[PDB]
Ligand binder design. Structure first.
Ligand SMILES: O=C(O)Cc1cn(Cc2cccc(Cl)c2)c2ccccc12
Ligand SMILES: [Ca+2]
Ligand SMILES: [Ca+2]
Lengths: 426, 420
């Protein structure tokens, strides 16, 4: 389904597969509003959301409602732009507010997207919507397609520089405007004290950047390591599970997007370490864990409610797939009672990745007068050292490097273990 | 591209997306042959795709062989072929990957004009609606619990049905539960024969992918996969993950129904992994087989794999060639006898198993386990001398270990230098 679908008389979920410049986020909502519908447009990015707002005011004199974590504008317009996260914060689908809900970038596999889309799919028909649109340029299974403005050239091993087992001739980046992607911060410019180039701000130049550079600077060529760092969960049974990082081949939305920084209307050249890519449409169980985490920490969802939402995400065709670990993660979080409220407040404030899990491990440490697994920033909420410095850490789960001695027999550790036996297969 | 590539005038590598329902490369080889060219076609197997019929090598300007055979023969013979077709080139078993990489590295020097990488399933393929197969989601309503959903007894009492489970144990358990409910349920998996009644009254076969015709297929939509973990305990672990099935799996399992008459496909999950990735453990398998079967130095295996990975439109893996080449280079003075035994016995990593065993015998120390992987060492108490010099984890460890052996330290150092 590649053109905006017509509003049915009764509820339907439709997939819209179309390019980024198709104005999925602008033209499509506008045409719906123009037909008299009230439409919600959901995006993962705060910057995106605020940016569609601004584009619609400047370009078309439409002042949308704009709802975002940090900021809220209410104009009474029939178009609302919101982040998935802010949408979850707002209770999800709240009453007959929207005829149409567009889940933009429905290929996103960050936690807000999965839980948000899950929530839309579970609640929309009941809340009175007629149409849900799952919109993306890059549905599951997508591979990057050749670009008319972008000639692509394989790096050979022949060139003065060390680049991921291959090499670049400086001839190719001297001079002009050049973007180079590396996977980590370290190598991102321990590409180095190398040699006009650095890893905010720059107006002839080479930019050596991670993915942190958000899409939409001038560039004549892009050079691409073709790998990226991703979060994964390991069931390491030491005693329970571990949240860690892995380096993996990039996927199609990665490659397309990195390549897309060049050839922006004027011809550009793309240079890669590797010709291939993972096709898009998979994500890790740790993203599920994060969804439960956020539901407990931010959205006051019992684990069982979160499950209902994620189950709807998973029962819906055409979305990224993942290991079915809903039962397991639901069980884990359901067991984590009586979290220290003040600790949770800080970890949220902190912007730790799993504020509920960080605060809870801190909570059992504090009650046991035991110290955190390490003294990484993550555990700042326990600056109460001497009374707790005593003895092993009761390890629930590994969220980072563990420096202290540990014990493994706390009832909650054993509880998580029994959950692993209960809910994980083979 | 959807149609056979013109034979170029200088050496080229081409891709061919055969149509989605297509069988093993038959039409396309016939065309090139008709134009006067000698064609080699390579598949994982030359058995009829149907599982019934003649071999593809039945008797000429068209030779049909396998990647396995091709590797065993030593690769591209002299100037024997103009055109080599690597068919089902989406296969990610060690033999297909090593074999294709070998073609890619050797074909031009061996006087071929054209290498064709053919598949009905390029990377990123998804399963498509089959016009003869109705697909119905399983709900949570039903007598028989099934991977978080339920199978109603009504859709399988009477008729013939196939149910895919991810593991032998699940197959045993499900069959038992069907039998107690009055259903004629038979379980199938590796190690069994044809207890599956091919007489042809009512039956519900519960099997893995080790597997007559069926009125319906019920799919758990998950599969068991071999993976490496760089676990640092002390080194790496070859283990199994249970993942969402991919498009070839979904297509192939669903395929068992609607083969003539209309069919029913029932599923636990609407989605699938996209096809086109394999694990670094396959790279490890490739070096293992290079050392164990094909008389390849690790560096010769590297050249073959590098050619594979430098080639677009093929499945992708982490680039761990330097790493794996590194660890096998360090694995010196393997005991010849043990390697024979692990090879005869069909272990997955004959070289690695026999090397860990070689290190035991020298240290005179026992195996990590006594699973039947470690057979070669039932010299079981000239030494029971405690601690096992653990190089890597190939399974579960039941003996106490020592992370002290120099080979252990060498691999660890390969890991820190070659990975990231
Ligand atoms: O900043 C925004 O606009 C989006 C947003 C993110 N969160 C928190 C969060 C973090 C990580 C995962 C999830 Cl599901 C939610 C929120 C929590 C409340 C309101 C909004 C948000
Ligand atoms: Ca592990
Ligand atoms: Ca790991």
């Amino acid at each position: 389904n590649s053109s905006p679908p017509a509003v049915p008389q009764s509820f339907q979920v439709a997939h819209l597969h179309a390019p980024t410049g198709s104005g999925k986020s602008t033209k499509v909502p506008a045409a719906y509003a123009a037909q008299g519908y009230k439409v919600l447009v959901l995006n993962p990015s705060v910057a995106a959301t605020l940016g569609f707002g601004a584009y619609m005011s400047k370009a078309h004199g439409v002042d949308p409602n704009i709802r975002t974590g940090v900021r809220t504008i209410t104009t009474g317009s029939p178009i609302t732009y919101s982040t998935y996260g802010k949408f979850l914060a707002d209770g999800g689908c709240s009453g007959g507010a929207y005829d149409i809900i567009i889940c933009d970038e429905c290929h996103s596999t960050d936690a807000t997207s999965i839980l948000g889309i899950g929530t839309v799919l579970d609640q929309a028909e009941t809340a009175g919507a007629r149409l849900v649109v799952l919109a993306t340029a890059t549905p599951p299974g997508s591979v990057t397609v050749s670009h008319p403005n972008i000639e692509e050239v394989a790096l050979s091993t022949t060139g003065e520089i060390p680049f991921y087992g291959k090499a670049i001739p400086l001839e190719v980046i001297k001079g002009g405007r050049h973007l180079i992607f590396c996977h980590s911060k370290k190598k991102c410019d321990e590409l180095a004290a190398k040699l006009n180039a650095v890893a905010s701000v720059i107006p002839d130049v080479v930019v050596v950047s991670t993915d942190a550079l958000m899409t939409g600077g001038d560039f004549d060529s892009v050079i691409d390591c073709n790998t990226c760092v991703t979060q994964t969960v390991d069931f390491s049974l030491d005693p329970t599970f571990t949240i860690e990082t892995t380096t993996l081949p990039q996927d199609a939305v990665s490659r397309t997007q990195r390549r897309g920084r060049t050839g922006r209307g004027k011809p550009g050249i793309y240079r890669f370490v590797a010709p291939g890519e993972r096709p898009s449409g998979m994500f890790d169980s740790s993203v599920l864990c994060e969804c439960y985490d956020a539901g407990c920490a931010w959205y006051e969802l019992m684990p069982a409610e979160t499950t209902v939402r994620l189950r709807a995400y998973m029962n819906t065709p055409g979305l990224p797939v993942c290991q079915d670990h809903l039962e397991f993660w639901e069980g884990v979080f359901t067991g984590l009672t009586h979290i220290d409220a003040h600790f949770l407040s800080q970890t949220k404030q902190s912007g730790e990745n799993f504020p509920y899990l960080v605060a809870y491990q801190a909570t059992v440490c504090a009650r046991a007068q035991a110290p955190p697994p390490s003294w990484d920033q993550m555990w700042k909420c326990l600056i109460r050292l001497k009374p707790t410095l005593h003895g092993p850490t009761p390890l629930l789960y590994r969220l980072g490097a563990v420096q202290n001695e540990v014990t493994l027999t706390h009832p909650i550790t054993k509880y998580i273990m029994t959950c692993m036996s209960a809910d994980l297969e083979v």
